[PDB]
């Protein structure tokens, strides 16, 4: 029976896990202690005494972020064994998190994940959260995926990650981590959800009228993305869709596993008073480039696969009228080899609403997972920034001093150049 285990890595992973597990707590009705005053069993592990424990492993290379959870509201909810800490961090260095500091605690996380899924009988997959910017989220995440694949050759590895924003950046040495990590998400990943923080900044300000957001506002918006993905597993629906169902209809070739997400409607309560919301209305905003969670225009590319995930008061009648209306639009492109590129999932339960949240209660919802080739331009900008670094060999002595050979820098650059080349081959129409 379905069970998903979260392997959140890094400061982003811990803060995301605080937001995501809060939503899961309110969806099933979990008290902050963890007692009800079996849809929970995919996420909350029921013990004998009525106590329910999240099936998550928070891991970070510094204690300060995890210790806030240790002294937070949900301190008694989480297993202290699950929350793994470390004395020293990678400090924006992939090499420190891959060859010196990771190996001290690569072993410990493996045994903790070992115990979590030993409790589980039928494991669906692994939901893994990290970042391409930080050293721990990029370095330490790379080894565990490498070690998870040899331990679990068949188990699924979904990859929700923070990609570097095209313009704003929290660090300078970020592209070195970003380039070197992309090998891991190619040969040790099944699907990928790179998200830049900049796109949500526009989306939250333009739509939710929050002129001064914070990471919680971003982490909440990441929250129901996973919830709408796992809604079919948790709750019954007209068209229940498992993770294997949408993995198949999104990946035409093993080298292409980088789709783009989209959520709708995303609108404040005082705003939502004025628009009647229908299936056609919410599905049209899912194709608008202004609502993309990646800074790229699919109008410059072509869609090759889309996963539809309706949720709430949706009717299969209005599903097909929306799909047909979408298909009669020249502004939307499609490849020649995919005449039918839709995978519709329908769920009964409407999305619950978190307190202190901008989103109003809405009776129906919609989720998009569109794989298109317009993502390839984002890596090209990274290639422009990475190559223009490597000519002067800036910050190289840091990575060399950790004990890793500088030739891997060229190899990682070479791989992504081939990866961009592969996306243009699909863009060719015969």
């Amino acid at each position: 029976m379905r069970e998903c285990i979260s392997i959140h890595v890094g400061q982003a992973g811990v803060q995301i896990g605080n937001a995501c597990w809060e939503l899961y707590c309110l969806e099933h009705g979990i008290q902050p202690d963890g007692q009800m005053p079996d849809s929970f069993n995919t996420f909350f592990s029921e013990t004998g005494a009525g106590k329910h424990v999240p099936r998550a492993v928070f891991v970070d290379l510094e204690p300060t972020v995890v210790d806030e959870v240790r002294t937070g509201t949900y301190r008694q909810l989480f297993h202290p064994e699950q929350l793994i800490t470390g004395k020293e961090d990678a400090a924006n260095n992939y090499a420190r998190g891959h060859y010196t500091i990771g190996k001290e605690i690569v072993d410990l996380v493996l045994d903790r994940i070992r115990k979590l899924a030993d409790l589980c009988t039928g494991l669906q997959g692994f939901l893994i959260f990290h970042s391409f910017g930080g050293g721990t989220g990029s370095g330490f995440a790379s080894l565990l995926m490498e070690r998870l694949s040899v331990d679990y050759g068949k188990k699924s590895k979904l990859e929700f990650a923070i990609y570097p924003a095209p313009q704003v950046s929290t660090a300078v040495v970020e592209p070195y981590n970003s380039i070197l990590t992309t090998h891991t998400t190619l040969e040790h990943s099944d699907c990928a959800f790179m998200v830049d923080n900049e796109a949500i900044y526009d989306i939250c300000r333009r739509n939710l009228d929050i002129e001064r957001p914070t990471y919680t506002n971003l982490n909440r918006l990441i929250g129901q993305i996973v919830s709408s993905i796992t809604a079919s597993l948790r709750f019954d629906g007209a068209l229940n869709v498992d993770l294997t169902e949408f993995q198949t209809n999104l990946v035409p070739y093993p080298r292409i596993h980088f789709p783009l997400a989209t959520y709708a409607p995303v609108i404040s309560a005082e705003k939502a008073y004025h628009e009647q919301l229908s299936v056609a209305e919410i599905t049209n905003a899912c194709f608008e480039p202004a609502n993309q969670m990646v800074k790229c225009d699919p109008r410059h590319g072509k869609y090759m696969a889309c996963c539809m995930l309706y949720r709430g008061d949706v009717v299969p009648k209005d599903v097909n009228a929306a799909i047909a209306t979408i298909k009669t639009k020249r502004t939307i492109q499609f490849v020649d080899w995919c005449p039918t590129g839709f995978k519709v999932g329908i769920n009964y339960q409407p999305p619950t609403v978190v307190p202190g949240g901008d989103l109003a209660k809405v009776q129906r919802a919609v989720c998009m997972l569109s794989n298109t080739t317009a993502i390839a331009e984002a890596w090209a900008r990274l290639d422009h920034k990475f190559d223009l670094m490597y000519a002067k060999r800036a910050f190289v002595h840091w990575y060399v001093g950790e004990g890793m050979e500088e030739g891997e820098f060229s190899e990682a650059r070479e791989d992504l150049a081939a990866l961009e080349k592969d996306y243009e081959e699909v863009g060719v129409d015969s």
């Binding site: 229940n240 294997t244 993995q247 209809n249 990946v251 093993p254 097909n320 799909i323 080899w337 995978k343």
Partner: protein, 430 residues
């Protein structure tokens, strides 16, 4: 005597089969508990066709519910008629196919087939004289389209003489719920042509436009779609269960219906479909039943017969009516639309009469028809299959299962040869 074992596969087949088992429960006056609350003696005379005897005046449906995912079984047992089926008859695995035909047919279907084979052998040997089997599934799935075909191939070897009807669900190209649907569809029709006595190709899109125009339901759910499907399967065996002026059964039709073994695909039809505003302005007569059914809009296939030639046509009528009027109405339509009937077969229409009307209604009729226009959909699948296959797209999922490549070629070759010989019967000089 003449019993039916109702096969059931996939989320599709489980939901329609749940609806189908509900309607005939109403016809035979069975409560959700399992006892008989009917009034007429004929309501309990031939109940052993679908029901099996249990102690204390109880009857169990003779169905074998199969699905690779346990979630649909929970939804089945939680319905109104959820506690009428024998829990031993529920056979299910822990992992689904994920819309992959190859996983359902080779990898995961090989474990569950033995358990289902033992259930049906238990059920088949129980009945005295089994007329034949009957299966419902979807071609756009992973279990019914997958393992469901593997079940057919095994038991045809086991039980060759018995009839095989399938209410298979053919995906529509205008609206699609799967991206890899041509692959599952193509690899299933090749299994259909070799081992199937008769097929009812029912299209969901052809169901949708009915509810828009014929019934004018604002919010047609899947229950309405299943209810219309349920009315069809009841209308085939209604003369079997109840005596009439001119009786029939499945073998009465299939012997009369297929001129050649390579042609066993029909477009089913149901006559009394009127909206609530239509009840005010109507007169229940035999000509109105004939006029409404011969309209192509009433059809639950995705193919206009006016582009093809009607090889053979059935009209199974339910009720007490004039036999002269049904004799004359078919004779009139055979002469008026002469070009739409082939000339090498005179009197292309076969009729049977069942005295008992459907519950809550006075007059009804059913239509089973083989026409040349059904090749319009198979070639449209080849239009989509070859477009995706020529680039080897979505192939590693299937290739990883261990199957070879020539299976795609031979399955496409069989359907190309099928539509080739299907075409030649259209332009044939008598």
């Amino acid at each position: 005597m003449r019993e039916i074992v109702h096969l059931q596969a996939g989320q599709c087949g489980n939901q329609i089969g749940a609806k189908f088992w509900e309607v005939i429960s109403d016809e035979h006056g069975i409560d959700p508990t399992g006892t008989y609350h009917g009034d007429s003696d004929l309501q309990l005379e031939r109940i052993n066709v679908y029901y099996n005897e249990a102690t204390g005046g109880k009857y169990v449906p003779r169905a074998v519910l199969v699905d690779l995912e346990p979630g649909t079984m929970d939804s089945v047992r939680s319905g109104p008629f959820g506690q009428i089926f024998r829990p031993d008859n529920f056979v299910f695995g822990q992992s689904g196919a994920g819309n992959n035909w190859a996983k359902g047919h080779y990898t995961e279907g090989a474990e569950l087939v033995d358990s289902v084979l033992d259930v049906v052998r238990k059920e088949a040997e129980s009945c005295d004289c089994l007329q034949g089997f009957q299966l419902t599934h979807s071609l756009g799935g992973g279990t019914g389209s997958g393992m469901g075909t593997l079940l057919i191939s095994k038991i045809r070897e086991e039980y060759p003489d018995r009839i095989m009807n399938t209410f298979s669900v053919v995906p529509s190209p205008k609206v699609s719920d799967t991206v890899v649907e041509p692959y599952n569809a193509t690899l299933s029709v090749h299994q259909l042509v070799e081992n199937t006595d008769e097929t009812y190709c029912i299209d969901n899109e052809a169901l949708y436009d009915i509810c828009f125009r014929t019934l004018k339901l604002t919010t047609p759910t899947y229950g309405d779609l299943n209810h219309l499907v349920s009315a069809t399967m009841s209308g085939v065996t209604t003369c079997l269960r109840f005596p009439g002026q001119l009786n029939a059964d499945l073998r009465k039709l299939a012997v009369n219906m297929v001129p050649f073994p390579r042609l066993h695909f029909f477009m089913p039809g149901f006559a009394p479909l009127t909206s609530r505003g239509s009840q005010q302005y109507r007169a229940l007569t035999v000509p109105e039943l004939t006029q409404q059914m011969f309209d192509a809009k009433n059809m639950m296939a995705a193919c206009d017969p006016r582009h093809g030639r009607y090889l053979t046509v059935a009209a199974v009528f339910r009720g007490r009516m004039s036999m002269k009027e049904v004799d004359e109405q078919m004779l009139n339509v055979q002469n008026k639309n002469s070009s739409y009937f082939v000339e090498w077969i005179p009197n292309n229409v076969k009729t049977a009469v069942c005295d008992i009307p459907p519950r809550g209604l006075k007059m009804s009729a059913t239509f089973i028809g083989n026409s040349t226009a059904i090749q319009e959909l198979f070639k449209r699948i080849s239009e989509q299959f070859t477009a995706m296959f020529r680039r080897k797209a979505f192939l590693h999922w299937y290739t990883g299962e261990g199957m070879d490549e020539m299976e795609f070629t031979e399955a496409e070759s069989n359907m190309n040869d099928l539509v080739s010989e299907y075409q030649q019967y259209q332009d044939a000089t008598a």
